[PDB]
Amino acid sequence: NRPNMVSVGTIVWLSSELMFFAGLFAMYFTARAQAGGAWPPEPTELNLALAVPVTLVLIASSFTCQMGVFAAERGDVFGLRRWYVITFLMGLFFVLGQGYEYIHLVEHGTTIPGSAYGSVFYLATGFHGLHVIGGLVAFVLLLARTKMSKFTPAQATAAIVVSYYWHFVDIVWIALFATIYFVR
Amino acid sequence: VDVEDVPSAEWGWSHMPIGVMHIGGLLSAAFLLVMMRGNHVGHVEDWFLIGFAAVIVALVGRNWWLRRRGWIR
Amino acid sequence: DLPYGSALTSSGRISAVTEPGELSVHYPFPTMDLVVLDDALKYGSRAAKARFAVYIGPLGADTAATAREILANVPTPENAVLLAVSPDQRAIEVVYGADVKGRGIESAAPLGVSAAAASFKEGNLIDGLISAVRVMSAGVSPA
Amino acid sequence: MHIEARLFEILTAFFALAAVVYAVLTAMFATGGVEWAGTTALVLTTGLTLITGTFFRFVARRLDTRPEDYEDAEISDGAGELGFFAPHSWWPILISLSFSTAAVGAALWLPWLIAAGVAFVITSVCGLVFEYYWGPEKH
Amino acid sequence: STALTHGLIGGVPLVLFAVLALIFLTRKGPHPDTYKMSDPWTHAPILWAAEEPREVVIGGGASGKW
Amino acid sequence: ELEARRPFPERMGPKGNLIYKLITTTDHKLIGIMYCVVCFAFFLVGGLMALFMRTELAMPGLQFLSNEQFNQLFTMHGTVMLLFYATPIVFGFANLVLPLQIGAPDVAFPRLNALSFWLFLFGALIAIAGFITPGGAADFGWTAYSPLTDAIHSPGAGGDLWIMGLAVGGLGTILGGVNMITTVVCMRAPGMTMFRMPIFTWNILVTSILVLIAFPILTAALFGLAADRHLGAHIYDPANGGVLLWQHLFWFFGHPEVYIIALPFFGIVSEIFPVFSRKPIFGYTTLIYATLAIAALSVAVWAHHMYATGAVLLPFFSFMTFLIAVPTGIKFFNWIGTMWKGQLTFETPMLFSVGFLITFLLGGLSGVLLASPPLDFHVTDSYFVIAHFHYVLFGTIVFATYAGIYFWFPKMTGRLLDERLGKLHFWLTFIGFHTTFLVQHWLGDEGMPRRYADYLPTDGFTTLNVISTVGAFILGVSMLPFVWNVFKSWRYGEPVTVDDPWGYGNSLEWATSCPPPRHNFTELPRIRSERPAFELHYPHMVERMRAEAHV
Amino acid sequence: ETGIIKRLPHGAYVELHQPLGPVDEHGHPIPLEYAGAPLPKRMNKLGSGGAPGTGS
Ligand code: HEA
Ligand code: HEA
Ligand SMILES: CCCCCCCCCCCCCC(=O)O[C@H](COC(=O)CCCCCCCCCCC)COP(=O)(O)O
Ligand SMILES: CCCCCCCCCCCCC
Numbered sequence A: 001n002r003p004n005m006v007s008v009g010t011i012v013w014l015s016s017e018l019m020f021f022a023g024l025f026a027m028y029f030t031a032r033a034q035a036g037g038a039w040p041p042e043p044t045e046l047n048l049a050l051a052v053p054v055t056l057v058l059i060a061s062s063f064t065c066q067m068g069v070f071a072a073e074r075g076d077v078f079g080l081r082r083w084y085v086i087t088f089l090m091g092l093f094f095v096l097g098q099g100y101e102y103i104h105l106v107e108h109g110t111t112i113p114g115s116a117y118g119s120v121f122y123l124a125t126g127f128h129g130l131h132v133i134g135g136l137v138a139f140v141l142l143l144a145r146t147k148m149s150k151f152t153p154a155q156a157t158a159a160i161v162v163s164y165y166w167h168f169v170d171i172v173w174i175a176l177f178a179t180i181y182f183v184r
Numbered sequence B: 001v002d003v004e005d006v007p008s009a010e011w012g013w014s015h016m017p018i019g020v021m022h023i024g025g026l027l028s029a030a031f032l033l034v035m036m037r038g039n040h041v042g043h044v045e046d047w048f049l050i051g052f053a054a055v056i057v058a059l060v061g062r063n064w065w066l067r068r069r070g071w072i073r
Numbered sequence C: 001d002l003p004y005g006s007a008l009t010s011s012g013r014i015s016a017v018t019e020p021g022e023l024s025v026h027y028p029f030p031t032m033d034l035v036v037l038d039d040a041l042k043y044g045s046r047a048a049k050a051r052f053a054v055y056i057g058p059l060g061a062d063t064a065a066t067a068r069e070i071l072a073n074v075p076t077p078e079n080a081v082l083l084a085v086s087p088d089q090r091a092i093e094v095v096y097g098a099d100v101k102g103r104g105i106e107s108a109a110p111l112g113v114s115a116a117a118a119s120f121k122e123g124n125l126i127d128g129l130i131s132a133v134r135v136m137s138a139g140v141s142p143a
Numbered sequence D: 001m002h003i004e005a006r007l008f009e010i011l012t013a014f015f016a017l018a019a020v021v022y023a024v025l026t027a028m029f030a031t032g033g034v035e036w037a038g039t040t041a042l043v044l045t046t047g048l049t050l051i052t053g054t055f056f057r058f059v060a061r062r063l064d065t066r067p068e069d070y071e072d073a074e075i076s077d078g079a080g081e082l083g084f085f086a087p088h089s090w091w092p093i094l095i096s097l098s099f100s101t102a103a104v105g106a107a108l109w110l111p112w113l114i115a116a117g118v119a120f121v122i123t124s125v126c127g128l129v130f131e132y133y134w135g136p137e138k139h
Numbered sequence E: 001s002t003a004l005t006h007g008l009i010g011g012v013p014l015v016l017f018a019v020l021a022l023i024f025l026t027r028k029g030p031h032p033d034t035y036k037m038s039d040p041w042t043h044a045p046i047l048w049a050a051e052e053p054r055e056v057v058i059g060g061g062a063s064g065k066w
Numbered sequence F: 001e002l003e004a005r006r007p008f009p010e011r012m013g014p015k016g017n018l019i020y021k022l023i024t025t026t027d028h029k030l031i032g033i034m035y036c037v038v039c040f041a042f043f044l045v046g047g048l049m050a051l052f053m054r055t056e057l058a059m060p061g062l063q064f065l066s067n068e069q070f071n072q073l074f075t076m077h078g079t080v081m082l083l084f085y086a087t088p089i090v091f092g093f094a095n096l097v098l099p100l101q102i103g104a105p106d107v108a109f110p111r112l113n114a115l116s117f118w119l120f121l122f123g124a125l126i127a128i129a130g131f132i133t134p135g136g137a138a139d140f141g142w143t144a145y146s147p148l149t150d151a152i153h154s155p156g157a158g159g160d161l162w163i164m165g166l167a168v169g170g171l172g173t174i175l176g177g178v179n180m181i182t183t184v185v186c187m188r189a190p191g192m193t194m195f196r197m198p199i200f201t202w203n204i205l206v207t208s209i210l211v212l213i214a215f216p217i218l219t220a221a222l223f224g225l226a227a228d229r230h231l232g233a234h235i236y237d238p239a240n241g242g243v244l245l246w247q248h249l250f251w252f253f254g255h256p257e258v259y260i261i262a263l264p265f266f267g268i269v270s271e272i273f274p275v276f277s278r279k280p281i282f283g284y285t286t287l288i289y290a291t292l293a294i295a296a297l298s299v300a301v302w303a304h305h306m307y308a309t310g311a312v313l314l315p316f317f318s319f320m321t322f323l324i325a326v327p328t329g330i331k332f333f334n335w336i337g338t339m340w341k342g343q344l345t346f347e348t349p350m351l352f353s354v355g356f357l358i359t360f361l362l363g364g365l366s367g368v369l370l371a372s373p374p375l376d377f378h379v380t381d382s383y384f385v386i387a388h389f390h391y392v393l394f395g396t397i398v399f400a401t402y403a404g405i406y407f408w409f410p411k412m413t414g415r416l417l418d419e420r421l422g423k424l425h426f427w428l429t430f431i432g433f434h435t436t437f438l439v440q441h442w443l444g445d446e447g448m449p450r451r452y453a454d455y456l457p458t459d460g461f462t463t464l465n466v467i468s469t470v471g472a473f474i475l476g477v478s479m480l481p482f483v484w485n486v487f488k489s490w491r492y493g494e495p496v497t498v499d500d501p502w503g504y505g506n507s508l509e510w511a512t513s514c515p516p517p518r519h520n521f522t523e524l525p526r527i528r529s530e531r532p533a534f535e536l537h538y539p540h541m542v543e544r545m546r547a548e549a550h551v
Numbered sequence G: 001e002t003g004i005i006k007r008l009p010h011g012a013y014v015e016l017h018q019p020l021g022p023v024d025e026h027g028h029p030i031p032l033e034y035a036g037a038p039l040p041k042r043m044n045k046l047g048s049g050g051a052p053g054t055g056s
């Protein structure tokens, strides 16, 4: 009969977090306008054979995260744990996939000090990867709390607000993925 | 000390004489003042010693005066 | 019957106001003198485990029977020692509960009367109360 | 809670208008074309009010009038338990100390101090989250 | 000059502080005037009691007059 | 009807009454008090920095300061005043009365509220800790213009500590803003609708929205600067367009940030004027629209700080900057209308509020002068600019801050500050401020640029600099009476046994004891307007206020 | 202190407390005497959180 206080606090903070990514987006666009015709410039060669499967995994993690919310709203703690463990594994795969992309980009001459494109690319995607890592920590902390006490409505609220952050992270990546790999 | 000030007054050592803290503070400031005797050629440190010694002396004097007038016990 | 700006709340508490720049207490004594008396009352009661009280006002015609009624307003009146002073009556009524009986108040109560009377002759009301409380509290044991 | 999001929708419309106007006005008769830094900030400033306003719009249409949303509600209408509010906690000062340790390490570029700070933050955040959920000791 | 500059910087704030303090701190505060024995007790009756110790048959009393 | 009372209220709590509370409290009342003491310590610390500069600028030639030390001084002086004093004390007043104003027992997130204080205290200490490094603290100005902040031009660790200290404190501000939005939306008492809240509550809620827009982008910009200095990135490289990239982001943060420390103090005087005028706030409904318009407009006028760069669209920002003056002018007419045909008594909270009106206007009039690019082409980066933000900040974060302190001190402490000492403090502050800041309009117009450590005897700036130096030291000695009043009146001040020491309070905090209990309320009255306490204390005036509300 | 805030019908805000011993007829607990042992301060440490559920 009353709005969820934790949900309102999380959504309010999630809106503010978007302005942090606004600054990173401004840096990428400012450097893109000064590229001069090459964006990305040589020797940076983005490959979609790896980014696309990595992006699809993160998108699929949102669906399983939503499934855990349905279990949490249903009062099924075991269903919530199964879906959030699966979500954590795919979220971890996203971090490993991004890092594996980072290793090959560095070997081919795309680094933060190497070029202006490397600076904006790594800051924008790296800070998002830090947000993904923070989301994985939230999953572990929330799941550890599931083994401490009985499944209460306040505990179910904590599961919902964590999924809000995960959905926010996934949506931001879609903007980053479309802006970097398609709007060149 | 009374149980109103220290609730666990009867469970352990809870009182230190005020004379020990007052004399210790005065000796505290005196040791800071004698440390200006040395081989250092700068005086930035000396002013820091003077300020800390003055603060300690002022605190000791304020506490002693307030206890003498009876405003604090 | 409530004063101006005062209201009775739904919980029974009285929500009062005072005009800006005015005082809500306004006792006709210096602030520092009040602090000394409060310290004498607080620490004197602590040292004797008996609540000491001071009353300043009228005491009817037979002061002794007014003090007796007045002591019923002191919290825990059975373990309380009240000193009543009537400037217009120029008298000193001292009353104590049954719990204080036999703890040395009988020797100290006249001394508190004498201490208060000596300072009252000099035109010192707060000083007389402070002196009376100090001597009476020092003569009462926590037993 | 119909007023709360009406505040954000009103801000959303103005931010959307300013973002569109600034982008168009910088595209034409402005050196360098579209000024990307301000345009990006204005566009995502609209996003901030849009997400909060949309959420408040969905919450408002679900639940009926609250006692604080009534134009003539009684104090007794709000009787009942409000919720859980933490009485005391020394974890928040530990979280800030943990975060300040990492910031100092990042300021002076000490990777060991950064690693210690990150580990301290995780432990401090874990204590805050688990503070009111730890069970009794089992022996 | 240089002596006048240091005189104004150190002198005017102290002179202004003294003048303004004499204007305001010499005024009468809202505190009531101390009661005098020669004057009648026109104040409301006052009952003061200590809060200690933390929480009606009389045991006796005494008389007195000054 | 004899009720036993102590001869005097307890001066201080027993041994151990505070130290464990300070590190474990979740009470907004104690936390709000903790924000005032620390913010007032930082204000004293930063004021000493200005005294050093102002003494140095009294005479031509470097008497005791170097160029580097002077450059570090105005950077840190400005950082402490803007981010370590003004921004936190906004939440200082929020934790004091906002839960009381909406009839709430606590903030939405008590532990997150405590986290903001410590994040803010340790973040401020990190930035100030640059002064203990051999190189010194940051010396590129609080604006931190690029590429002056690059590792090539600012290699010292003082700048790095400045960047990281701001990031930690900015996180606390964001969390505090999140707490205040949630508290207003969810913790309102029954019958307290959105359009019945006090103006101060409205201002804080709207300000917290501005925090969520300005501070995250500042954190993003600072992290990009940290990447350049430590990872060798090219975010703010001039060849990459980073000169204007830093300015755009920093001013998109900065100008919404100065209304974060303007609107709440607009709300403070909006609470004080009706109380001492014995009349309801004039245009209560319109003041909310004015605040909302000011908040909305402040987000798209950032580039008027970049007129002289020759790289911004002048007509767009010049026009919208002119638009801000309209809602701000509306607030003056409501404040004057509130005082109009009232019964003014001019106590210390009211006296400081009147000083706000006089001081804020002159700084505001200089604002429209600066808003025009042609006039700003001569006075930008000069002491005329210094005169604008000093008249217009001083009124809000000092005059209204002191007005709120005097207004709410009996509420949060149960003791009244001395009025005679308060009047001396107000007049000393007013005279010193005007003496030290009136002549700076002439200095900037004459040709004296800002951020100069030294000038020449033939420049013609000596006489006005001496006058400004005399006034600044009056502001320094104006500090002693207020500190003495707070120190003495906190234990020996006049006791407050009533709910409303000012008689005609309107908001809900005046319907509770002084100080309020742990959960702020032992009862609540019927809420039917924006003056519930006035209705509770004066039931007979309820009919009159409804009948006479419209002119 | 259980951390649960309750609003009374007349508007009072009170926090629910868990007594560690006998209570009065009014409901307020009888004050207990310190015995040199640690005292609980969190309801979850007293078993109020229960158990999640037996299983993997
Ligand atoms: C926001 C609030 C704010 C406040 C309150 C002030 C307060 C004062 N400031 Fe301002 N200032 C700024 C905000 C503020 N400032 C900003 C944003 C800048 C930008 C700088 C930049 O370009 O980066 C600035 C820069 C600035 C300049 C420009 C200097 C230059 O560019 O060269 C000057 C010029 O004199 C100035 C002077 C003063 C003076 C005399 C006070 C008076 O308030 C000071 C008097 C106050 C005191 C508190 C005196 C202290 C007295 C004591 C007794 C202390 C004792 C304490 C101990 C012993 C511990 N400051
Ligand atoms: C409290 C903080 C605060 C507030 C409230 C303001 C309010 C305003 N400011 Fe600003 N400003 C600063 C803090 C503030 N400012 C700071 C800190 C800087 C410099 C930062 C730095 O460089 O470090 C700055 C610098 C700054 C500049 C850039 C100067 C430069 O560097 O060249 C400009 C230019 O447009 C500007 C204009 C305005 C205007 C038009 C208002 C308006 O909001 C004011 C409008 C108010 C009135 C007009 C009075 C009321 C109106 C009426 C009674 C009706 C009258 C109508 C007319 C005259 C048309 N100020
Ligand atoms: C990092 C491990 C990842 C494992 C992959 C699967 C993800 C889900 C893990 C669930 C763990 C459940 C543990 C549990 O319930 O124990 C609970 C207690 O756990 C803790 O207190 C600590 C948990 C671990 C903290 C993690 C900190 C660092 C996070 C790093 C993130 C990368 C059970 O407590 P109990 O005694 O039963 O009350
Ligand atoms: C309280 C008002 C103070 C006004 C100070 C300004 C004085 C200006 C004098 C200029 C003299 C030039 C030679």
Ligand SMILES: CCCCCCCCCCCCC
Residues within 6 Å of the ligand: F362, F365, F366, F438, F439, F441, F442
């Ligand atoms: C809004 C602009 C205000 C200008 C104030 C000027 C102060 C007078 C200075 C006189 C200097 C004479 C040399």
Ligand SMILES: [Ca+2]
Residues within 6 Å of the ligand: F055, F056, F057, F058, F059, F060, F061, F062, F063
């Ligand atoms: Ca000089």
Ligand SMILES: [Cu+2]
Residues within 6 Å of the ligand: F255, F304, F305
């Ligand atoms: Cu501006």
Ligand SMILES: [Mg+2]
Residues within 6 Å of the ligand: F305, F308, F380, F381
């Ligand atoms: Mg400039």
